[PDB]
Amino acid sequence: FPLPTGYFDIPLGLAALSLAWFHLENLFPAARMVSDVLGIVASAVWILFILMYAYKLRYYFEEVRAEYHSPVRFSFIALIPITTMLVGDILYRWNPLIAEVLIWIGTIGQLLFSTLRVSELWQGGVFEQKSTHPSFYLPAVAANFTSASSLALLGYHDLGYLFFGAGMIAWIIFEPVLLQHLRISSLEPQFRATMGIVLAPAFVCVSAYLSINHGEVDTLAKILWGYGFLQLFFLLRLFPWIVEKGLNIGLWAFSGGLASMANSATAFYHGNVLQGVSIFAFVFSNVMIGLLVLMTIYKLTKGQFFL
Amino acid sequence: FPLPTGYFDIPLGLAALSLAWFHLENLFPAARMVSDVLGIVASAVWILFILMYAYKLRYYFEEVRAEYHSPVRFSFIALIPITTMLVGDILYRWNPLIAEVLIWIGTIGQLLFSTLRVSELWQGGVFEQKSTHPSFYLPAVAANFTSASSLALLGYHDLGYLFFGAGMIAWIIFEPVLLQHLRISSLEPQFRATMGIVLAPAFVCVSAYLSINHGEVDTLAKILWGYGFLQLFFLLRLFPWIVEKGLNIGLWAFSGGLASMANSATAFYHGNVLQGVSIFAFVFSNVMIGLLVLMTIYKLTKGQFFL
Amino acid sequence: FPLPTGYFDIPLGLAALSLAWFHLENLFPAARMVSDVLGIVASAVWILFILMYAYKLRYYFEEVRAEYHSPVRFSFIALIPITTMLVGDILYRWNPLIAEVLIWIGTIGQLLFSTLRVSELWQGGVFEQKSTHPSFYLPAVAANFTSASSLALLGYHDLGYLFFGAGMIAWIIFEPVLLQHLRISSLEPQFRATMGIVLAPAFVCVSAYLSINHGEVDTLAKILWGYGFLQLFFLLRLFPWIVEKGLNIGLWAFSGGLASMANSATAFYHGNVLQGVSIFAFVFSNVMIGLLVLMTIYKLTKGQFFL
Ligand SMILES: CCCCCCCCO[C@@H]1O[C@H](CO)[C@@H](O)[C@H](O)[C@H]1O
Ligand SMILES: CCCCCCCCO[C@@H]1O[C@H](CO)[C@@H](O)[C@H](O)[C@H]1O
Ligand SMILES: CCCCCCCCO[C@@H]1O[C@H](CO)[C@@H](O)[C@H](O)[C@H]1O
Ligand SMILES: CCCCCCCCO[C@@H]1O[C@H](CO)[C@@H](O)[C@H](O)[C@H]1O
Ligand SMILES: CCCCCCCCO[C@@H]1O[C@H](CO)[C@@H](O)[C@H](O)[C@H]1O
Ligand SMILES: CCCCCCCCO[C@@H]1O[C@H](CO)[C@@H](O)[C@H](O)[C@H]1O
Ligand SMILES: CCCCCCCCO[C@@H]1O[C@H](CO)[C@@H](O)[C@H](O)[C@H]1O
Ligand SMILES: CCCCCCCCO[C@@H]1O[C@H](CO)[C@@H](O)[C@H](O)[C@H]1O
Ligand SMILES: CCCCCCCCO[C@@H]1O[C@H](CO)[C@@H](O)[C@H](O)[C@H]1O
Ligand SMILES: CCCCCCCCO[C@@H]1O[C@H](CO)[C@@H](O)[C@H](O)[C@H]1O
Ligand SMILES: CCCCCCCCO[C@@H]1O[C@H](CO)[C@@H](O)[C@H](O)[C@H]1O
Ligand SMILES: CCCCCCCCO[C@@H]1O[C@H](CO)[C@@H](O)[C@H](O)[C@H]1O
Numbered sequence: 001f002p003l004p005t006g007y008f009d010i011p012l013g014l015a016a017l018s019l020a021w022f023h024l025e026n027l028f029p030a031a032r033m034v035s036d037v038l039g040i041v042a043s044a045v046w047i048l049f050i051l052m053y054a055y056k057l058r059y060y061f062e063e064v065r066a067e068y069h070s071p072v073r074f075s076f077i078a079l080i081p082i083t084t085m086l087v088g089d090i091l092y093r094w095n096p097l098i099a100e101v102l103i104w105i106g107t108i109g110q111l112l113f114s115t116l117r118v119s120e121l122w123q124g125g126v127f128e129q130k131s132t133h134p135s136f137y138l139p140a141v142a143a144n145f146t147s148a149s150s151l152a153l154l155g156y157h158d159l160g161y162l163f164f165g166a167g168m169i170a171w172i173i174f175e176p177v178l179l180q181h182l183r184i185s186s187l188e189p190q191f192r193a194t195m196g197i198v199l200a201p202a203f204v205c206v207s208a209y210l211s212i213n214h215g216e217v218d219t220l221a222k223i224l225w226g227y228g229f230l231q232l233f234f235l236l237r238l239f240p241w242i243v244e245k246g247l248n249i250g251l252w253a254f255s256g257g258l259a260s261m262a263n264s265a266t267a268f269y270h271g272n273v274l275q276g277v278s279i280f281a282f283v284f285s286n287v288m289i290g291l292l293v294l295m296t297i298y299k300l301t302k303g304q305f306f307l
Numbered sequence: 308f309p310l311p312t313g314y315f316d317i318p319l320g321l322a323a324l325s326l327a328w329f330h331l332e333n334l335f336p337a338a339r340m341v342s343d344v345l346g347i348v349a350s351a352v353w354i355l356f357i358l359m360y361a362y363k364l365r366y367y368f369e370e371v372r373a374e375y376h377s378p379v380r381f382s383f384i385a386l387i388p389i390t391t392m393l394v395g396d397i398l399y400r401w402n403p404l405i406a407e408v409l410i411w412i413g414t415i416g417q418l419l420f421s422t423l424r425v426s427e428l429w430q431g432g433v434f435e436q437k438s439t440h441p442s443f444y445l446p447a448v449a450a451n452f453t454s455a456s457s458l459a460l461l462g463y464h465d466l467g468y469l470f471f472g473a474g475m476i477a478w479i480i481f482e483p484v485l486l487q488h489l490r491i492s493s494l495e496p497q498f499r500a501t502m503g504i505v506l507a508p509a510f511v512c513v514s515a516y517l518s519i520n521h522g523e524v525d526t527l528a529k530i531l532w533g534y535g536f537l538q539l540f541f542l543l544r545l546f547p548w549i550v551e552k553g554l555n556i557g558l559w560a561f562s563g564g565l566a567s568m569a570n571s572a573t574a575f576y577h578g579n580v581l582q583g584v585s586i587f588a589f590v591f592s593n594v595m596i597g598l599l600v601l602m603t604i605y606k607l608t609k610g611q612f613f614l
Numbered sequence: 615f616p617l618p619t620g621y622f623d624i625p626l627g628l629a630a631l632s633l634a635w636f637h638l639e640n641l642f643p644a645a646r647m648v649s650d651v652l653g654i655v656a657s658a659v660w661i662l663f664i665l666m667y668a669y670k671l672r673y674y675f676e677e678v679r680a681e682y683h684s685p686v687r688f689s690f691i692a693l694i695p696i697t698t699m700l701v702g703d704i705l706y707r708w709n710p711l712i713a714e715v716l717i718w719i720g721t722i723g724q725l726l727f728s729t730l731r732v733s734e735l736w737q738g739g740v741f742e743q744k745s746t747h748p749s750f751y752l753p754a755v756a757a758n759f760t761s762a763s764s765l766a767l768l769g770y771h772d773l774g775y776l777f778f779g780a781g782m783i784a785w786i787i788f789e790p791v792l793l794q795h796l797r798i799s800s801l802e803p804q805f806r807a808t809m810g811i812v813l814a815p816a817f818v819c820v821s822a823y824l825s826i827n828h829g830e831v832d833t834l835a836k837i838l839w840g841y842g843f844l845q846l847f848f849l850l851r852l853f854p855w856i857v858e859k860g861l862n863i864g865l866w867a868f869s870g871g872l873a874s875m876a877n878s879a880t881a882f883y884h885g886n887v888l889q890g891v892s893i894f895a896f897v898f899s900n901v902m903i904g905l906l907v908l909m910t911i912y913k914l915t916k917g918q919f920f921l
Pocket of ligand 11: 479832
């Protein structure tokens with residue numbers, strides 16, 4: 001099937017950057033235009049990708065079956081509901097009713113998804129030590145942070161805090177065994193682009209947190225940013241090793257983290273906290289996601305995108 | 308010996324539900340009656356069980372010796388001081404002086420217990436990977452949350468926060484390796500009823516927290532509830548697997564978690580936060596502990612309770 | 615080479631105790647004298663030790679090379695920048711300009727150090743399960759807490775909170791796998807003195823936190839203290855096992871934790887919170903670091919300090 005599930009990272013990353021620029025509108029009006037263009041690109045890619053995936057469910061169902069049951073690959077499916085909610089969040093600026101349908105479909109879906117599949121891992125005997133990949137953050141952690149921000153947007157803040165709490169504690173509970181496994185075993189080259197997901201948790205956390213708490217940059221938020229930057233420096237240093245066997249579309253896995261860096265940076269800028277670190281983060285993230293776009297345009301014009 | 312240490316889960320669960328109903332008195336006066344009846348049942352079962360256990364110490368001491376030294380079974384002993392404190396908490400409504408004796412005996416006991424036994428595990432060579440069971444939450448985590456709430460009740464809030472902090476950080480520090488071990492190895496049928504303890508931490512946490520912080524439902528509390536509900540959904544889905552080889556009195560291990568669900572729910576209802584989720588949680592927990600009571604009455608009348 | 619890297623624990627511990635006494639000046643003026651004497655001793659030992667280590671870099675460079683690459687021994691190098699910052703903090707009372715040079719050198723150094731070396735562990739294949747030692751807290755956790763407090767002192771509170779957050783979350787993320795490894799494997803006698811580092815995190819955490827947050831003893835701070843005392847009781851009980859094969863200069867590894875116990879205790883005393891527990895902690899820590907000094911004076915006069 002020509003569409004790898006992982007490619008939902010593309011509208012994921014583009015949609016989150018849209019939302020990041022959106023929060024700048026009231027400081028710099030031209031940011032709205034930029035926010036709108038990214039949101040439209042992201043929504044169109046999401047529509048294309050949802051229709052391709054429906055095509056897969058219908059005619060390549062065994063391949064979805066097998067990725068669903070894999071203790072490793074099941075995770076990427078969580079990107080479907082996540083981008084669904086993020087597109088819904090973009091659309092809210094134009095049609096709050098369609099946005100809310102999309103947000104609930106995505107929230108119910110991810111919750112149902114993790115309850116069915118993540119819990120089942122606890123029966124033992126299928127997940128193995130080498131199953132301890134960064135992609136596990138998706139169903140467990142990123143899905144919940146996205147429901148939390150998206151439900152806040154619709155005015156459900158208390159409900160938002162529940163899903164936030166689920167994401168935050170799930171993250172702290174998984175990372176310990178992940179980092180220990182990387183230390184000991186690490187990852188073979190073909191999985192290494194997924195190290196980009198390791199960037200995500202702190203930054204997606206604080207961005208979701210600031211969405212629910214009215215943009216108030218407090219101690220918790222500063223604390224998350226600190227640890228976010230620590231992981232960024234580590235990943236920067238690791239980058240040559242990560243792309244040891246070459247650059248590839250898998251690198252879109254950094255995009256959710258990078259985009260949350262941009263988003264959180266806008267909140268910090270608004271609240272007048274580390275404004276310089278903010279400008280740096282926002283510009284850095286944008287340039288990098290920009291490089292991902294240029295490399296994806298390159299591959300599209302060398303017939304090397306789809307399978 | 309006819310009394311398994313695990314059976315202290317019974318007055319544990321009944322006592323915590325008593326305390327849960329107690330907090331409803333000022334919204335609905337008939338809740339006091341219900342709180343009192345459960346507290347009396349719980350206290351009577353606790354007296355019976357304490358006298359049976361003293362009997363074991365005296366005439367079956369090798370069996371206590373061996374459970375004490377087991378890296379797995381030592382944990383259930385922590386239920387003795389825990390229920391001791393909870394009974395003390397019930398009794399406070401009638402006799403604050405006896406309640407405080409019981410609360411200090413239970414606090415000193417659990418602290419002394421964990422300091423002697425839990426620390427010793429760090430000498431290595433006795434605890435094994437397959438020793439990573441949910442029952443380890445008892446000495447480490449539940450004991451401390453119970454001291455914290457119980458010491459708050461007597462007016463020692465700052466002292467309460469120390470034990471709370473010990474419980475909360477101990478929990479976050481153990482769960483990561485527990486969940487990883489369940490993923491990989493899981494648990495054989497005879498230990499599976501102890502999955503019910505996994506429900507407990509978030510809910511016992513927030514309940515203890517609300518006891519110390521004057522019932523103020525804040526961000527931390529909402530965060531804990533979110534993760535509590537995530538684990539509930541997982542455990543619900545896992546339930547058929549949990550009771551694969553049949554229903555049994557071991558299922559009383561859910562009761563501390565269920566009861567803390569009820570207790571925290573009353574605090575949330577009072578503070579006007581997610582009142583509907585609150586009614587659901589309170590009713591759910593009560594029905595389930597109610598089912599545990601009916602199944603225990605059933606077994607008592609088939610001579611299948613004691614050994 | 616006559617100086618083991620670990621011996622930087624000596625000025626580390628002495629410098630942190632200096633800072634602890636410093637905070638008592640405004641309650642009890644004679645504490646300044648005591649603070650100054652310790653700070654001078656600590657600074658002189660630090661100068662001696664820095665010059666010995668420069669000597670090692672220059673003429674014994676292969677030995678630094680090999681300790682740098684060890685997945686276990688690399689950690690102790692982090693003590694160089696840590697004590698550098700702490701000496702800088704002492705000196706601030708006399709010369710704020712030299713203090714700030716030292717603080718930035720130490721912050722840039724530790725950050726650069728961890729980014730180069732700690733991240734590299736994630737390439738796998740060098741760090742092993744038996745590499746899971748308490749010394750790993752140094753580069754990861756203690757280095758960051760020291761930058762955070764030291765940058766607060768110079769007036770950079772928001773920057774302080776970033777490094778604090780990095781330390782705090784790094785700690786919670788490592789301890790889980792550490793404690794599990796001690797439970798299963800523990801440590802051979804020659805590494806056991808490093809159990810003293812396990813005392814450090816909660817107490818260094820809360821001390822750094824109180825430095826940044828203006829000494830305000832809040833819920834988070836009480837929570838950290840609770841868990842700090844839990845680990846203290848465990849370590850007390852473990853002590854005979856720790857010194858099974860004899861007392862040795864390695865025991866200076868407790869000194870950062872003990873000194874942070876003293877420091878945090880002063881903040882708690884000021885804010886009128888658990889003042890009695892505070893007096894106990896302050897006196898306890900001082901007596902113990904005092905015993906370490908007497909045993910070090912003893913060994914110095916038996917020619918059994920340097921190699
Ligand atoms: C979007 C992701 C879709 C998930 C596809 C799920 C595969 C379901 O799993 C299957 O379903 C059958 C019953 O329905 C089972 O009995 C099969 O044994 C099992 O393979
Ligand atoms: C894309 C997000 C929505 C979730 C869709 C997945 C539906 C799961 O499918 C389920 O797979 C199970 C195994 O866990 C089967 O046993 C069940 O019959 C089936 O309901
Ligand atoms: C695991 C990481 C969790 C870090 C805990 C967050 C610290 C909470 O910070 C708190 O909230 C307010 C925010 O300005 C402060 O006023 C409070 O005094 C402080 O306790
Ligand atoms: C998330 C960070 C993005 C916000 C970027 C805006 C940077 C604008 O730059 C700032 O403009 C100010 C006035 O508007 C000037 O006075 C500042 O000195 C200048 O740095
Ligand atoms: C309520 C739980 C009671 C715990 C029973 C503890 C068993 C103690 O342990 C024992 O104690 C002896 C000394 O007292 C030791 O020397 C024995 O070796 C050891 O087995
Ligand atoms: C029920 C809660 C109270 C705690 C009672 C347990 C007392 C522990 O018993 C102890 O066992 C040790 C091993 O750890 C022995 O070495 C000690 O001699 C003994 O004091
Ligand atoms: C590991 C899980 C810890 C979650 C951290 C709790 C977040 C603390 O929440 C804090 O406390 C107050 C409560 O309303 C808020 O005002 C503060 O602004 C916020 O920082
Ligand atoms: C922990 C939750 C338990 C509290 C349960 C009480 C539910 C009562 O029900 C509520 O009564 C209100 C008035 O008292 C009505 O006005 C509400 O609409 C009704 O929902
Ligand atoms: C204060 C601690 C100093 C760290 C000493 C670092 C050892 C560096 O590591 C080395 O550096 C060379 C290049 O510079 C490498 O190519 C060598 O392979 C590698 O051994
Ligand atoms: C004492 C704190 C300051 C940090 C000094 C250490 C400098 C690291 O040295 C580095 O070692 C690398 C391997 O990780 C080599 O590959 C690099 O060439 C070298 O830059
Ligand atoms: C992992 C351990 C983290 C513990 C979380 C800290 C709890 C934060 O405590 C918070 O900050 C203020 C401090 O007085 C309170 O007012 C807030 O109401 C409370 O949420
Ligand atoms: C970190 C704790 C160190 C502070 C130690 C000072 C202890 C002094 O002691 C206190 O002095 C008070 C007046 O100053 C008396 O009134 C108190 O009762 C007495 O306990």
